[PDB]
Design a protein around this ligand. Structure first.
Ligand SMILES: [Zn+2]
Ligand SMILES: [Zn+2]
Lengths: 222, 222
């Protein structure tokens, strides 16, 4: 039982349960500040998405769209199926110090259960059509809603896919490491109104403080 | 008591003491097989060594040359002081599957205790002059020897300092992560008998099995 505030806030996650120990002692945690950058000859990430956003949930921590099987990405010659995607506000990652009002995470897992997460950052701009579909059918804490017209996550990704990569963790407990982070450089857009609705629904900030890089470097596509 | 053989051996380390837990749950462990390589514009590592190798130690696990303060490397704009260098046989790291008969670790530390280790691999050849100076006056088990003539770790490093870099751990308990690994590509040389003395003295292999890369990539300087 964790939250973003107070007794159950981020600085205390590591002590709440024994399962949450990596939140306290891990040295490869997320989010981070994309700062220690190095140009590296990374390959374009092959993406095969389909309209699979079948249901929408509110676990009180985020708004999560569950994904039905068949959509995936390839990283390191390994196929990771898209399982779900959710949002944080403000952004969990900061880029060169810069904080963004909104962030989307696309969570994938391969046959052995290893995760690869795509992070997409948003700025204030035009009302976003995909978000509007999700926002229309926004449930209350604990509740889920099935969707007759399924959503496609590819449309939330920027058109230009140049990305940062690094080895990090889940940004919520148990903060397990060994997560491949793929952070898109190009910023997406949603309205100021769309952001505010989200925040109210959650009860404030929903981001974990940036975590030290320590020995890591952030790689940037050539 | 941890060792390289049996029930106190590497597959069992994580289970012995709670202080060793990262050895079993860690996902950014060392050594690794240097395989998933990506070309990166890494900076040339600035090295300022002086003849500072003052004493030799036998802790039963390795032969450690303690270094007097004053020698350092610069990584990520941070000054990492050389504290010591020690040995393993065979190599802890492997390059493209290839294992070496002998490996040197140069352990450095910054203001806050963050470690950055340079790894050098050796192949068989003629008598290594620097290894010989060390070999001709090994201590009795557990005890130390001041050297009278200071050793320069610089002479154990190859002429070409082209390197692989990655985020890993100590290769011995407690296997703490957050370690900067810098592995030189160019192979150094020492004799087959110099290798054998070290092996008989240690009682066999003194390397941890390679650990999975998991989410990591190895960067290679361009
Ligand atoms: Zn997230
Ligand atoms: Zn070592």
């Amino acid at each position: 039982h964790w939250s973003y505030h107070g007794e159950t806030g981020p600085q205390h996650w590591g002590d709440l349960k024994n399962e949450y120990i990596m939140c306290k002692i891990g040295k490869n945690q997320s989010p981070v500040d994309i700062s220690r950058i190095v140009e590296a000859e990374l390959e374009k990430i092959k993406i095969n998405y389909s309209s699979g956003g079948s249901s929408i949930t509110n676990n009180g921590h985020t708004i999560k769209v569950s994904y039905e099987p068949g959509s995936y990405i390839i990283v390191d010659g390994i196929r990771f199926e898209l399982k779900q995607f959710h949002f944080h506000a403000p952004s969990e990652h900061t880029i060169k110090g810069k904080s963004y009002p909104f962030e989307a995470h696309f969570v994938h897992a391969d046959k052995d259960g290893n995760l690869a997460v795509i992070g997409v950052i948003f700025k204030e701009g035009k009302k976003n059509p995909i978000i509007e579909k999700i926002w229309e059918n926004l449930p209350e804490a604990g509740k889920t809603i099935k969707l007759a017209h399924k959503i496609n996550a590819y449309d939330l990704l920027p058109k230009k896919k140049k990305y940062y990569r690094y080895s990090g963790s889940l940004t919520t407990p148990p903060c397990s490491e060994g997560v491949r982070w793929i952070v898109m450089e190009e910023e997406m857009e949603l309205s100021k109104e769309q952001i505010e609705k989200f925040r109210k629904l959650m009860g404030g900030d929903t981001n974990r403080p940036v975590q030290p890089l320590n020995a890591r470097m952030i790689m940037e596509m050539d």
